[PDB]
Structures are given as C-alpha cells and as structure tokens.
Design a protein around this ligand. Structure first.
Ligand code: GAP
Length: 442
C-alpha cells in the first residue's frame, strides 16, 4: 500500500500519470489531465472491464451515448428537482449570502442565444443515456429479459468541493451497467452483481483486505435506489466509495416511458407528459407488458485508478542501498509490459538491435513494449519500477556479438530484470518470447 495521498499525487506528476488540468494558467481545480502513463493505465482498466462485462458475457449489449443531454431527460430523471430550492445563507447558519440554487449539473445552451428553450446539461452520470435508449436497443438486438446494456463514459458534476486528488472531481468517467430484470428477481440479481463486481476488483489487484461492501441505510438510500451497496476501498485518506452496486427499481424506465399509468409502475415516478415511446418489455410466455427493474453497477474509472495506484505503490527498502518506490501493478495492467534498454547509448549497432527487439516483442501481443533509450540504466531501471512495468530487458555488447573476453556465446541472449524480485536472469532472445507469454498473458 501507498502511505499518503500526497506521495501518490507526487508520483503521478513526476511520472506523467496525472497532470493538473490547465496548469500553466492557474489550473481549473477539480479537473485533471491524464498524462502518458496515466492514459495507458486508464485505458487498460477500461478495456479489461469491457472484456469482462461484455465480451465474456452473453446477456449484455454495449452502448456509448453522448455527453450532451436534452433538458427534459434530466428533468423526468428527477435530477432537476434536486436543485429547485434556493439557499439564502447567512452569518452562522445555512439555507445573508444571496440565494444560490446550488445545482450540481453543469449547464449549456444550444446555439443562437441563452434561452431556456435551447438548454442542455452535461450528463452528471452515464446512466440516463441507457434508460432513454432502452427501446432503441431492445429493437435492434431483440433481447430476451435476463439482460443488460453497458457503457463507459464521461460524467460532469459541478462538485461544490473537489477533494483528494483524482477522487471527487468535476469531470470524470464511469463504467456503468444497467441490468434489466423481471420484477421478482431483482433481489438475486442485486446480490449476484455485488459479488461479481467485488470478484472483479480483486482480480484487478485490490486486496480483499481493503475492499468492503457496505449496505447504504434508508437515510442514504437516494431516491431511485430501493437499495444500494457500495464497495468501499481503504484509500490512503480513508475507506471511501469505489463502486456503487445500486438497485433502482423500474423508476428510471418508469420516469421515462409513455403510458406510465397503463404500465404497472411500482415506483413513485413523475407524470411523464413527454416520452415519444413506451420504454417497457413485453413477453415472458404470457405477453404481459411490464417495466423491468434494474441492478446498476457504477464504478468510477478515475477512482479505480486511484485505488490501483494506492494499492500498488509499495516502497520497499533495498538490502544494499536505501529504498525504492515500486508500483506493483497487475502486469497485465501496467502502462508498459516490457521495456527494452540499450546498455550504451553510443553503439548504434546495439541500439539498432534494441529497437529491433522491441518490435519482435510488441508482436507477441502481450501489450505495450517500450524502447527506453534514457541515459543511466540505473536511472532507466528505476524510472520503470516507479511506473510499475513488469520486465526490463537490457541489451549490451555481448548480445550483439562483441565483448572483452572475445566471447560471442553471450550473443542473442539478453538480461531480463524483474520488477518485484529485482532478480536478473540472462536469457536468449527466443526464450524471452515464451517467458513473457507465461507472465503477461491474462
Ligand atoms: N465526482 C466524482 N468523481 C469521480 N467518481 C465519481 C464522482 N461522482 C461519482 N463518481 C463515481 O460514480 C459512482 C457511482 O456513484 P454516483 O453518485 O456517480 O451515482 C451514480 O452514478 C448513479 N448512476 C461512484 O462509485 C464513483 O466512482
């Protein structure tokens, strides 16, 4: 584990993981930019989640709706209502500083002028994009009930207060699922998904010891959610929310469908005077139109990253030197898998061999390979553990052929230094393939 968020924040900048957004002009607090190594890690997390919840499954369809949301969507979603109370602050008390309707959803206008007619919010959550497209998806796929639609996407929130690095921010991405289910089964499903999502975060690298499901109680059970379970993580600042396996119940489709009344809505949904379409399902064997309940697993992509980094940032002491900080990311999720390093930057015959090898290895398809050509190998080696790349293959003279001893047997064999054990095997190129194949493969 990583001792203090500070370190994390500092490694993140010093290595190009996360940079402060708009830093040169003062920075837009609450919004960050993912530098080079950040992107990679971030994408890999996104990818693996997609593989898991979509490719490997057989009851999920994917989606990717837009950030701009038509004013009504967020209205019937109830999101509007949450800020229709102005706050007339005062000296020692609260809701006299002027009436501030403290809306958390960002706001923008559609062309021409700032009229209430052409208003649109930036989706505070990806979720809505799925509910409104429910029929559309159902039509094009023609899915039978035990099934859900899932997307990764941007989400903007005017967070009055952004706190703790890349945790609570104003702009972030979420990986959301909306498991549509027959009314009765909701209980199981909710259980199933919580267990699943916890199972996942573990294979991703988060130790079970730090993961904790927590039944939000009535007080905290937000409107749509009939129940909800968070999976908190023991971050370096605390045991906070990581993913939230909720259990809204036909409320979403209910607040968004035509004929709410005719439809047996069980949720206290607004009178939807708008929807152009009946967002409901039709036949189990009878032909009873009904509105599906949903289990919704929402993860924060950015926090998933905070977790993974916090969890992996270890700073062991060297049994010789002082100490080293070592990101020990699940190899398969490291920004770089293998980093090929030329021993002397001079010898062009060496470097060429190096650049050449990088190719051969990238080809295995175990992940990104890097031709690190930066100065001091001691420096290269370190840089790497700091960014947690699993294997550092280094090429010296002997590899190419030359040597002092006049030996060419060392040729085509390279030294592969392992991150965690810092152990240095010296294996022949052809073996290097098989070797990595065993480790970096999922
Ligand atoms: N400002 C923010 N920054 C980062 N992640 C955030 C966030 N606000 C919410 N999340 C993520 O959204 C997840 C779900 O909580 P939520 O309050 O976003 O609810 C919903 O998205 C309901 N669909 C959390 O587990 C968290 O990872």
């Amino acid at each position: 584990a990583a001792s203090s968020l500070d370190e994390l924040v500092a490694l993140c900048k010093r290595r190009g993981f996360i940079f402060q957004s708009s830093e040169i002009y003062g920075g837009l607090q609450g919004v960050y930019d993912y530098g080079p190594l950040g992107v990679e890690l971030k994408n890999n997390l996104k990818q693996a989640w997609w593989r898991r919840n979509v490719y490997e499954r057989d009851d999920m369809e994917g989606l990717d709706a837009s950030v701009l949301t038509h004013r009504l969507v967020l209205h019937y979603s109830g999101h509007e209502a949450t800020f229709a109370d102005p706050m007339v602050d005062n000296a020692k008390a609260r809701y006299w500083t002027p009436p501030r309707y403290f809306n958390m959803m960002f706001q923008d206008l559609r062309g021409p002028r700032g009229g209430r007619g052409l208003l649109a919010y930036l989706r505070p959550e990806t979720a809505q994009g799925i509910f409104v497209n429910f029929k559309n998806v159902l039509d094009a796929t023609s899915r039978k009930l035990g099934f859900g639609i899932a997307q990764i996407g941007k989400a903007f929130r005017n967070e009055i207060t952004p706190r703790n690095f890349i945790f609570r921010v104003r702009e972030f991405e979420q990986m959301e699922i909306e498991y549509f289910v027959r009314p009765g089964e909701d209980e199981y499903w909710h259980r199933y998904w919580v267990e699943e999502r916890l199972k996942w975060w573990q294979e991703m690298g988060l130790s079970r010891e730090n993961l904790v499901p927590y039944q939000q109680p009535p007080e905290s059970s937000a409107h749509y959610a009939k129940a909800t379970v968070d999976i908190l993580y023991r971050f370096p600042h605390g045991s906070l929310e990581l993913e939230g396996i909720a259990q809204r119940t036909d409320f979403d489709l209910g607040s968004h469908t035509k004929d709410q009344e005719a439809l047996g809505i069980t949720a206290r949904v607004l009178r939807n005077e708008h929807s152009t379409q009946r967002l409901a399902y039709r036949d189990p064997e009878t032909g009873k139109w009904f509105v599906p309940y949903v289990i919704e697993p929402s993860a924060g992509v950015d926090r998933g990253v905070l977790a993974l980094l916090a969890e992996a940032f270890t700073r062991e002491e060297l049994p010789n030197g002082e100490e080293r900080i070592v990101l020990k990311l699940k190899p398969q999720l490291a920004p770089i898998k293998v980093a090929v390093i030329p021993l002397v930057k001079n010898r062009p015959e060496i470097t060429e061999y190096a650049k050449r090898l990088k190719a051969r290895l990238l080809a295995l398809g175990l992940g990104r390979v890097l031709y690190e050509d930066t100065g001091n190998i001691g420096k290269a080696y370190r840089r790497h553990d700091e960014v947690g790349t699993p294997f550092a293959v280094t090429v010296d003279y002997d590899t190419i052929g030359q040597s002092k001893d006049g030996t060419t047997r060392l040729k085509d064999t390279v030294t592969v230094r392992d991150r965690d054990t810092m152990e240095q095997i010296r294996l022949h190129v052809d073996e290097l393939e098989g070797f990595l194949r065993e480790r970096l493969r999922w």
